[PDB]
């Protein structure tokens, strides 16, 4: 990298330690031209926040996982492929607007529930049956009554 | 093929016409050893009946198409992978027991509905919502009331 003082396009690396407790790499660099030393930090930049799953396992944001769940609930429903992509881009925008490096998968689920509530109410019931995990048939009718309010 | 009269392991083909209106190939064969002639018919043997789709399109029986639909409805349900395979083999046995060369996809759907009715009643409602195509939220509660009888 460019020397921050003289501006030689290349500096030699002097040291490499894991100072951010694994999260970051600290390096020392020396300029060949002006013989000056400087510290650098190498940090990871995520395109989308990492997802914290129900079992506290961290995994990368998977657009396909998000899409498939919606498409399953929107089977035989009058929602175009554009409406789905339009809802996915808005959910992505909402997860970025939090500013968080990681987001609970429950948050992704609630965002999908709000898109489906606007898109199709049958698709909403289908997704809620697996998302909220209805363990009884009664649970189905109780979620329909919840939607009338 | 073997001559049906003398039993020479090979006979020469004399003619080839599409007599079964495409469904069958008729051939004439002459034996090299005894100089006798005989007619043969070549017919297609299906492992499982071909499926007539809702739009009258004929397509081969796809075990994966059958399985996926069940697995979608059985999401987060206490039905083991063995229970699913046990239900699929029984549905396959039932389609073969008809003796038909082709079966309506509606018949495959009703068979899955009866397996899910035995396996899990929440999975049954999930599959019925896409299979019977609920076009309204009311349709959901009306199918729950149908199950109580
Ligand atoms: N058959 C279905 N009908 C309606 N909605 C469904 C169906 N299957 C899944 N969904 C919805 C509700 C679920 O909470 C959501 C995500 O499904 P799930 O199988 O948990 O996938 P996922 O994207 O979370 O990946 P993972 O395999 O890592 O859990 O999709
Ligand atoms: N999300 C879902 N929840 C519950 N059951 C589902 C879900 N998606 C599909 N099913 C059930 C009901 C459907 O009638 C059945 C078959 O689904 P469908 O998409 O029509 O596939 P298929 O096997 O008929 O293939 P094809 O793509 O040729 O129509 O599976
Ligand atoms: N890695 C991921 N990236 C994007 N969406 C995800 C991811 N994992 C799960 N989802 C979505 O989060 C929502 C809720 O998932 P859920 O099944 O409740 O969580 P989990 O996978 O933690 O058990 C669904 O819309 C699902 O498709
Ligand atoms: N080619 C196939 N082979 C096996 N099962 C199939 C096939 N096509 C559809 N099915 C199954 O038939 C049932 C009803 O399908 P449905 O969606 O009602 O019909 P269609 O595909 O004709 O629109 C479901 O269990 C589905 O998975
Ligand atoms: Mg999941
Ligand atoms: Mg189908
Ligand atoms: Zn320098
Ligand atoms: Zn012969």
Numbering used by the authors:
A (entry chain A), B (entry chain A): 1 to 149
Sentences reproduced from the published study:
NrdR is a bacterial transcriptional repressor consisting of a zinc (Zn)‐ribbon domain followed by an ATP‐cone domain. NrdR binds specifically to two “NrdR boxes” upstream of ribonucleotide reductase operons, of which Escherichia coli has three: nrdHIEF, nrdDG and nrdAB, in the last of which we identified a new box. Tetrameric forms of EcoNrdR involve alternating interactions between pairs of Zn‐ribbon domains and ATP‐cones.
We present crystal structures of EcoNrdR–ATP–dATP and EcoNrdR–ADP–dATP, which are the first high‐resolution crystal structures of an NrdR. No other combination of adenine nucleotides promotes binding to DNA. The structures reveal considerable flexibility in relative orientation of ATP‐cones vs Zn‐ribbon domains.
